[PDB]
Amino acid sequence: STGSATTTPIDSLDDAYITPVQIGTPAQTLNLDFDTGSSDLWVFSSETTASEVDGQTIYTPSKSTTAKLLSGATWSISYGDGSSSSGDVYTDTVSVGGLTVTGQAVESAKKVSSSFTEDSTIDGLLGLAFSTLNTVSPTQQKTFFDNAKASLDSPVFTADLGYHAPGTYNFGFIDTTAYTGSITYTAVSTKQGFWEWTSTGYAVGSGTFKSTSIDGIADTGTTLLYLPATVVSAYWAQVSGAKSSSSVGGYVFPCSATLPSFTFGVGSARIVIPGDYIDFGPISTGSSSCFGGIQSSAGIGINIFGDVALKAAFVVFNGATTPTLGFASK
């Protein structure tokens, strides 16, 4: 089998992407944030504290003839950005882009943090990291990809995120029309439960390539590119007037600037992030200070190849017995 679904930016800055997901019978369609950095499929629901729901579409398991309470199971998750959610668990039929899994753990939120409530466009998350990170207790549950894998034509999914435009998540096949040149594959460590890999270096604008190993994760659920402070300082030094602002929480730059590109290495291959992808707009309405899309990972504890980086590429998440990652230009 295969599946193919369009993913759409939630706003004009590509702060996140939402993908429609069918849950239950008859189908209830919710717009979920596909997150290769976590492993829980959780939704706003009829069980979510009413004051914490503001415009989201909810899953109502009592209206689904295929929903079953997973008795005794609970979940609770905290994300890198400090947001969180928790609740109980149902199993139900879940379909993405024509690909159907029966018996999928659908984690129903009883509580969500303010960041989730305040974002009316995201109805929940669909985790695509390794199932070892799943938070369901006392019986850990599998991700949608893990459940689908044996049925797929090939044990892979791909992310093709757009810049200020829709893109695609495919399951079970590699669309050879969706990228230019060849896909370069690189080793993955699953030791921390992430799609963790090692970039071979970077360049700033038209500058020379610096060969240096940068360990990080491919994370579709993180907006920005988070790299070591040395690398990030070298980037922003090429933008007149750019500075790290502790009050804003990262590097900012004059909105009048033209940003240089940023290149990262994948083996001997190179992915070029255009300068425009690094512009996250005014820090507040009307300001002439703009937020940068490349930020320091210092104090995160890990480097993160988030959407800023991934949207410059066609990315293969290969879930073979020994997983790998593939990157192509597009």
Side-chain angles (χ1 to χ4, degrees), residues 1-62 64-67 69-109 112-141 143-148 150-190 192-242 244-330:
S1 59
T2 63
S4 182
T6 298
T7 193
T8 301
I10 66 165
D11 62 25
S12 66
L13 300 175
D14 299 347
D15 281 317
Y17 299 76
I18 50 172
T19 310
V21 178
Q22 283 69 51
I23 310 174
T25 309
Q28 299 179 41
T29 300
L30 274 64
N31 296 328
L32 305 186
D33 185 351
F34 283 23
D35 181 15
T36 63
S38 67
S39 305
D40 286 51
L41 193 175
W42 75 260
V43 298
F44 278 79
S45 74
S46 58
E47 303 182 326
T48 310
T49 300
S51 62
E52 294 179 352
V53 184
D54 186 7
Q56 295 81 9
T57 296
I58 61 164
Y59 169 59
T60 303
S62 70
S64 171
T65 59
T66 42
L69 179 73
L70 186 64
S71 181
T74 58
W75 63 280
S76 179
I77 193 163
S78 307
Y79 296 101
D81 67 354
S83 66
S84 64
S85 54
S86 61
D88 54 21
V89 188
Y90 294 81
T91 54
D92 210 340
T93 302
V94 173
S95 300
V96 176
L99 169 66
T100 301
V101 168
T102 56
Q104 175 65 44
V106 176
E107 301 173 35
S108 170
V112 305
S113 65
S114 60
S115 167
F116 287 115
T117 299
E118 296 166 359
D119 188 356
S120 66
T121 71
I122 292 176
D123 300 326
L125 267 65
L126 189 149
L128 292 168
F130 293 87
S131 293
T132 55
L133 298 179
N134 177 266
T135 77
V136 177
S137 179
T139 309
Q140 189 171 58
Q141 301 294 304
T143 68
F144 175 83
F145 180 52
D146 228 334
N147 282 323
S151 300
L152 295 177
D153 291 356
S154 182
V156 304
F157 68 90
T158 65
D160 181 7
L161 301 178
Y163 167 67
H164 292 357
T168 305
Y169 282 102
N170 290 331
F171 292 84
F173 73 106
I174 288 161
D175 180 356
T176 62
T177 72
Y179 58 86
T180 62
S182 51
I183 305 176
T184 296
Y185 290 86
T186 196
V188 164
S189 173
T190 61
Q192 296 190 94
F194 300 121
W195 293 90
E196 187 173 359
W197 64 290
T198 301
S199 172
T200 49
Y202 70 98
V204 177
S206 59
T208 61
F209 187 85
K210 174 70 169 188
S211 295
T212 185
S213 293
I214 303 168
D215 182 289
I217 65 167
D219 187 359
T220 58
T222 291
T223 312
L224 307 183
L225 175 52
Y226 293 91
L227 290 175
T230 48
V231 177
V232 176
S233 182
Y235 178 80
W236 290 109
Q238 297 306 308
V239 178
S240 294
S244 184
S245 168
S246 53
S247 60
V248 177
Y251 281 89
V252 296
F253 68 93
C255 295
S256 60
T258 300
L259 296 176
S261 64
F262 184 90
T263 300
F264 65 94
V266 183
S268 61
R270 307 287 181 255
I271 300 294
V272 181
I273 305 173
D276 293 343
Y277 291 27
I278 298 160
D279 178 17
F280 278 74
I283 59 167
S284 292
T285 301
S287 179
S288 70
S289 180
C290 275
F291 202 71
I294 296 175
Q295 296 296 343
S296 178
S297 64
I300 296 177
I302 195 158
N303 299 306
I304 306 175
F305 294 86
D307 298 334
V308 165
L310 304 182
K311 76 179 82 171
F314 177 87
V315 188
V316 181
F317 294 80
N318 171 27
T321 305
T322 298
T324 64
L325 273 171
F327 293 83
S329 296
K330 65 187 186 190

